[PDB]
Amino acid sequence: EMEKEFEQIDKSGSWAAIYQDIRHEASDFPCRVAKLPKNKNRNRYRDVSPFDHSRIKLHQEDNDYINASLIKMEEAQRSYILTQGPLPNTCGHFWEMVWEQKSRGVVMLNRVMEKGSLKCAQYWPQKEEKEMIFEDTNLKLTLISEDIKSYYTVRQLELENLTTQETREILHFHYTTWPDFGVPESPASFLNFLFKVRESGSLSPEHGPVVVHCSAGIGRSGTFCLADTCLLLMDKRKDPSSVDIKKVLLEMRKFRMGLIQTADQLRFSYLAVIEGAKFIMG
């Protein structure tokens, strides 16, 4: 089971210990392309890189690098592209990735500014009349509309390939209330956020994988993906309680390092899943 496991671990202050076990067991692969000197300014944090085997390649011939990994979950049949919050000089690359990968949705779990510093570039337009043009990748982005709510905001965007003049709609799911420190007391609003993302069909097979990111695209992003996959797995198995979340996290870490950066996020993950399963069946 996982239900009682949460009990044991929790009422034992075992979280910190487990997390470390995960860190210790996590896969270790080569990020050669990421550490090349010419890509130094394409990475936000020197200690957060994409494994070469699962990195996303840009379809340009100049430099196909971008700090982004493709988490491909075989059993749950779900794919996600986890990436770092774009840099002032990687916004064009970011949107080129969304286009080429035919993604339908972008999931953002942080604010442009947190703790007095920038955690992600303002990669999308804030006003309908002020559109953005990424000259280096020949892309145009326009804010069609947005729906601001209590703990999150959904925006409808129109991304256009200036080269072919082809337009495509993209949904921006911005969770705007993640706390300054630690994690949310309740996974409620986070769960509702995920469901809203599911409802849009952005996580579905007829589209390219969703693009998820916070600042490094491993911590909060990890909780998002992890919860989604674990929930989905519970929908597919005869015995839903057999879903071992550690096992799943470790499987995802084969595609990107660091997913879930603190014991808190690990606990929070357990919570959202557990509670999420309840809500679905009522």
Ligand SMILES: CC(=O)N[C@@H](Cc1ccc(N(C(=O)C(=O)O)c2ccccc2C(=O)O)c2ccccc12)C(=O)NCCCCCOc1cc2ccccc2cc1C(=O)O
């Ligand atoms: C130079 C510098 O400042 N680096 C920062 C970069 C950074 C990462 C995560 C954040 N975050 C996120 O959610 C996010 O944006 O993702 C948070 C982290 C902690 C708490 C809260 C948050 C939050 O935003 O809510 C950040 C938030 C703000 C600023 C910087 C954030 C950092 O902390 N590095 C530590 C190591 C992690 C990177 C690989 O780990 C590994 C690599 C391995 C490789 C191989 C094998 C085992 C390995 C094991 C590990 C491991 O330790 O698990």
